[PDB]
A paper describes a structure:
Coronavirus 3CLpro is a cysteine protease that has two N-terminal domains containing two β-barrel chymotrypsin-like folds. The active site of 3CLpro is located in the cleft between the two domains and is characterized by a catalytic Cys-His dyad. The polyproteins are processed by a 3C-like protease [3CLpro or main protease (MPro)] (11 cleavage sites) and a papain-like protease (PLpro) (3 cleavage sites), resulting in 16 mature nonstructural proteins, including an RNA-dependent RNA polymerase (RdRp). X-ray crystallography confirmed the mechanism of action of the inhibitors, which involves formation of a covalent bond between the active site cysteine and the carbonyl carbon of the aldehyde.
Hydrophobic and hydrogen-bonding functionalities were incorporated into the 3CLpro inhibitors to capture additional interactions, and the position of the cyclohexyl moiety was also examined using appropriate congeners. Inspection of previously obtained crystal structures of the dipeptidyl compounds in a complex with coronavirus 3CLpro revealed the potential to achieve enhanced binding interactions with the S4 subsite by introducing diverse functionalities at the cap position in the inhibitors. In the current study, a new dipeptidyl series focusing on the design of structural variants in the cap substructure were synthesized and evaluated for their activity against coronavirus 3CLpro.
Author numbering:
A (entry chain B): -1 to 72, 78 to 301
B (entry chain A): -1 to 72, 78 to 300
Amino acid sequence: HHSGLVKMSHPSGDVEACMVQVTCGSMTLNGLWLDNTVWCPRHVMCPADQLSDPNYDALLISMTNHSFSVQKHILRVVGHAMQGTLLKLTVDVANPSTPAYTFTTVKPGAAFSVLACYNGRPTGTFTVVMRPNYTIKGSFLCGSCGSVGYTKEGSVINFCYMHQMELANGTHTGSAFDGTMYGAFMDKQVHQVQLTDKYCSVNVVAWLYAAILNGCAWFVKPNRTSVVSFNEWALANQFTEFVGTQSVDMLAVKTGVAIEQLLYAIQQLYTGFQGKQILGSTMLEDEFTPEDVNMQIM
Amino acid sequence: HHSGLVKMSHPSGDVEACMVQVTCGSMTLNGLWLDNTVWCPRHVMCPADQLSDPNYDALLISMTNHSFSVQKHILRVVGHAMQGTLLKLTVDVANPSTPAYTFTTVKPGAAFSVLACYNGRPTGTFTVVMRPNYTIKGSFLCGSCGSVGYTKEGSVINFCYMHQMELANGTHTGSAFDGTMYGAFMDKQVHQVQLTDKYCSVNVVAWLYAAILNGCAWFVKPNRTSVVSFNEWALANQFTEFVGTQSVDMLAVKTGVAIEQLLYAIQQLYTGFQGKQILGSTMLEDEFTPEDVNMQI
Ligand SMILES: *[C@H](O)[C@H](C[C@@H]1CCNC1=O)NC(=O)[C@H](CC(C)C)NC(=O)O[C@H]1CC[C@H](CC)CC1
Ligand SMILES: *[C@H](O)[C@H](C[C@@H]1CCNC1=O)NC(=O)[C@H](CC(C)C)NC(=O)O[C@H]1CC[C@H](CC)CC1
């Protein structure tokens, strides 16, 4: 039986109306136009020559307001400033389609939508999970920097990601809108190695609840492992710490299966399912969130 | 190495702008507002009581324009007609933000984006493949009927799907905008014969090409199988006819691996990968298209 549990993105219209193209000399990428501000990655300021030890403090100083061209396809720059790894450009027109929005950094295991853009033109949307090593997967090619990731709660869009780079292993990372880069990473063109990844325990729990909700519960036993004992075990077996939420608790209540029974199950299934399947899979899945499961199965 | 091959949907803004809620007596669902026309599933006319064998012709006759209420959240009806399994409602105001559009009927193996809506409010977007048995997977709950699926050629939206129903196995089907149901399913709440799914061979080929481009070519041998023998093989082993395309050919040029090498490979890998992996999987994947792979890699 098909669960109906699929990778689902937020509708992108609200964010499509905010996307612009930013150009600084030879470099062109994408920007986010909210009210009188345009956000974009600061390496738009760097010529490909100096991309390996860029001196951003001196590059900023050398710019005037005319150094920046902002175009809308899907504007006059009257101020410029640097905030971490992002530029904050002030323009003389307030975006007439600015959504209600917040800037909140996301934590590992959280899911968000990405609107992939090239030259200020939205081309596609997909959902990603911030991994415990502060990378995301997804699809990003040359020119995609400035593409934004976001969630939506009510009328309020939370902008949480602005795309910056791709790593050697093909994963990706970027900034939060406070200007910090997710994970270590520096916006320089140099080899950077990401930390070891980990399974997102709370998302595995959610997925196993989805399985129970879908009729697949051969893996449930009376046996239980406590949260504290699971987290001790998790440090040493490449799982994140489990933190519960009202969202998980809703699934426990709905199914009548306690969280602690699923943490025990995870300790057994970790290694393989010995010929059985769960939701058409033979390994644990950690990219669906409790919120995903509550939305799409109930 | 993460290949960068993901399930990508079209930006939904253009379509969000056309979504409305349609109410008829006690039922409500979603509709599509293009110019002066609102499209919605005709079972909006059916009371819950009588969803097993509705008399749609008599329901339509029983109606008047004032039976139907249309509201845009994300409107007065002055005409109403039935086209197959859909209603075509004429409203007095034209949708100003009507995108350039056409109506197309997707074929099995083809991908399209879905805007899932409840009460006229877009809530989510995902991509599906029309399966060889004319169903789709996706995520659709109560109130989702009237959600639409679409492709894009340029700035032009091709509307191909309006959601109608769920089958006992959890899969879904809907109407094309000419009013016909994909796969001849009836918009009646009754058990119906669902054919068996098959592997979309052309998408399997595209996936193997993606593996090659990602530096996973362990399965590539100089051995070759012709299209016609493969297609003969495919009938007895739950695969679809392979039909080449310019998109596929681009991939054999990019990689330098010929189609027939991969058709031979499919015949071997169908039995299992024998301890090895392809793009993190131990089974063949058939929901990424030639167009996906070219676009994303
Ligand atoms: C801005 O559009 C790009 C996005 C890259 C391009 C290729 N795929 C992407 O996601 N960002 C960068 O190019 C970035 C600039 C520095 C200054 C941060 N550098 C970068 O991502 O380089 C990568 C390119 C890919 C290779 C392959 C492993 C490694 C370095
Ligand atoms: C219109 O919004 C719904 C969408 C369904 C409902 C639940 N999930 C969906 O995809 N369509 C219907 O409700 C449909 C109406 C008839 C007149 C076509 N009925 C329907 O899909 O019946 C299904 C419901 C689930 C059961 C499962 C054994 C089979 C029949």
